[PDB]
Amino acid sequence: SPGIWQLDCTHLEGKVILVAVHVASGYIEAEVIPAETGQETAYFLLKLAGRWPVKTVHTDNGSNFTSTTVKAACEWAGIKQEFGISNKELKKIIGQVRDQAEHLKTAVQMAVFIHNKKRKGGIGGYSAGERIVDIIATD
Amino acid sequence: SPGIWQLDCTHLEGKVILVAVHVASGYIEAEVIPAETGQETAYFLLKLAGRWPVKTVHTDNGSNFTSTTVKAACEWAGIKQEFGISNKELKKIIGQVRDQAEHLKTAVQMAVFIHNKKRKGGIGGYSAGERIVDIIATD
Lengths: 139, 139
Ligand SMILES: Cc1ccc2oc(C#Cc3ccc(C(=O)O)cc3)c(CC(=O)O)c2c1
Ligand SMILES: Cc1ccc2oc(C#Cc3ccc(C(=O)O)cc3)c(CC(=O)O)c2c1
Description:
The structure is a homodimer.
Chain A: E1 4-12, E2 15-22, E3 27-33, H1 38-51, E4 56-59, H2 68-77, E5 80-83, H3 87-97, H4 104-117, H5 128-137
Parallel strand pairs in A: 1-4, 4-5
Antiparallel strand pairs in A: 1-2, 2-3
Helix pairs in contact in A: 1-2, 3-4
The complex binds ligand XHY (2 copies).
Organism (chains A, B): Human immunodeficiency virus type 1 (HIV-1)
Protein name (chains A, B): Gag-Pol polyprotein
Domain Integrase catalytic (chains A, B): 1-136
């Protein structure tokens, strides 16, 4: 459970946002890429796996199953690719910040920041960022 | 101490690697950018700050003091920029992996992965990755 992530794509202003969700915490990492490709996905996974425990990645379609680069990233980093499994919450915050940022990728990272640091209902308990640290700190 | 980072640049194959070190853990985040610019630095800081507690960033020269974008990122994210303060360890591991990766940026992230996951002397105690989680988990 500390190593379980969901991976999805979302789209805004004709760009692609790669989104990884730490399922138990709701903690997010996101990346704006020029184009959906195996290589970009592989790179994102390798960066995420260098930063957090990533044991298993769930995706909801076949696209990641067709990349030899994703396959090599999986084997390099020890990530199990499993089939079968926030995007709209993220687009809401991106909409709140879009006009403080010249570039979409800036607004996406401002949205990721707010998502990971905020408390639920704006008061009490832990943010997603505190929750992932607390889940991992308990080995 | 949980929020204290050092920020530096390093260079390989004519590219620029942005390196942030969590001073108490030795945990690293790194990014290959096309060009040293204020904007790229600001973006890197905002991404790091969305992911970890970043309270204070130490740098060892004036370059980050001259960017209005870095200034705006600092104020947006609540990061204190302080003057006054791993690169060679990272270039060693990059040298070990360079030939498993077509792109330098891939080799840099493979190096970051090994740096953050390895134990000191290859046995016992915590990796940098476990150390940063343990330091933050103790609020
Ligand atoms: C308040 C704040 C905080 C962080 C920020 O990061 C950026 C940026 C950037 C960037 C642009 C282009 C490339 C590229 O060429 O790929 C890379 C990075 C800004 C500028 C903006 O967006 O308002 C910014 C502002
Ligand atoms: C085993 C393994 C693990 C992860 C990996 O990521 C990549 C990649 C990539 C990339 C290239 C170009 C852009 C760009 O156009 O900016 C962005 C990302 C690879 C391919 C390589 O480098 O060997 C790779 C392999």
